[PDB]
Amino acid sequence: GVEIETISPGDGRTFPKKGQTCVVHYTGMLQNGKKFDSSRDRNKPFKFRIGKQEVIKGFEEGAAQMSLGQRAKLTCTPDVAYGATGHPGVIPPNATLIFDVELLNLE
């Protein structure tokens, strides 16, 4: 259940495909909670490829549904990322996550 609310500007045509490594200025937010992760702090903007199940399922399906320059707003369900387990100390079990995602990439 990946729900998209895109802040408009970008190109809307450069869609992510397989074998493509892309760059995201993501920002983690817990729903009704504080931050937990920010690529903008470390300023190394998280180069990663598509398809090898590196990222969670909610971020992976939200990645391909974007384009270059766009700014989305993810809402990840618990069953796709951690909701049975929860990442220990950082993500509680049965959690719903909020992501500010901007795709500024190559390939």
Asked if 37 is an active-site residue, the reply is yes
Any domain includes 10: no
What type of residue sits at position 2? Answer: V
Any domain includes 14: no
Asked if 79 is an active-site residue, the reply is no
Backbone angles phi, psi at 2, to 5 degrees: -95, 110
Cα 35 to its chain centre, rounded Å, is 14
Any domain includes 78: yes
As for how many domains the chain has, the answer is 1
3-state SS, residue 101? strand
CA dihedral 46, 49, 50, 53 (to 10 degrees): -80
Host domain of residue 88: 21-102
Any domain includes 5: no
- From the candidates 50, 59, 91, 99, give the one annotated as an active-site residue: 99
- From the candidates 50, 59, 82, 91, give the one annotated as an active-site residue: 82
- From the candidates 48, 56, 98, 100, give the one annotated as an active-site residue: 56
Q: What is the C-alpha to C-alpha distance for residues 96 and 106, in angstroms, rounded to an integer? A: 29
Give the CATH number of the domain where residue 26 resides. Answer: 3.10.50.40
Asked if 99 is an active-site residue, the reply is yes
Long-range CB pairs of 11-18, under 8 A, 24+ apart, other chains included: 11/67, 11/68, 11/69, 11/70, 12/67, 12/70, 13/67, 13/68, 14/67, 14/68, 15/64, 15/66, 15/67, 16/50, 16/63, 16/64, 16/66, 16/103, 16/105, 17/50, 17/64, 18/50, 18/51
What is the resolution of the experimental data for this entry, in Å? 4.4
Any domain includes 71: yes
Any domain includes 6: no
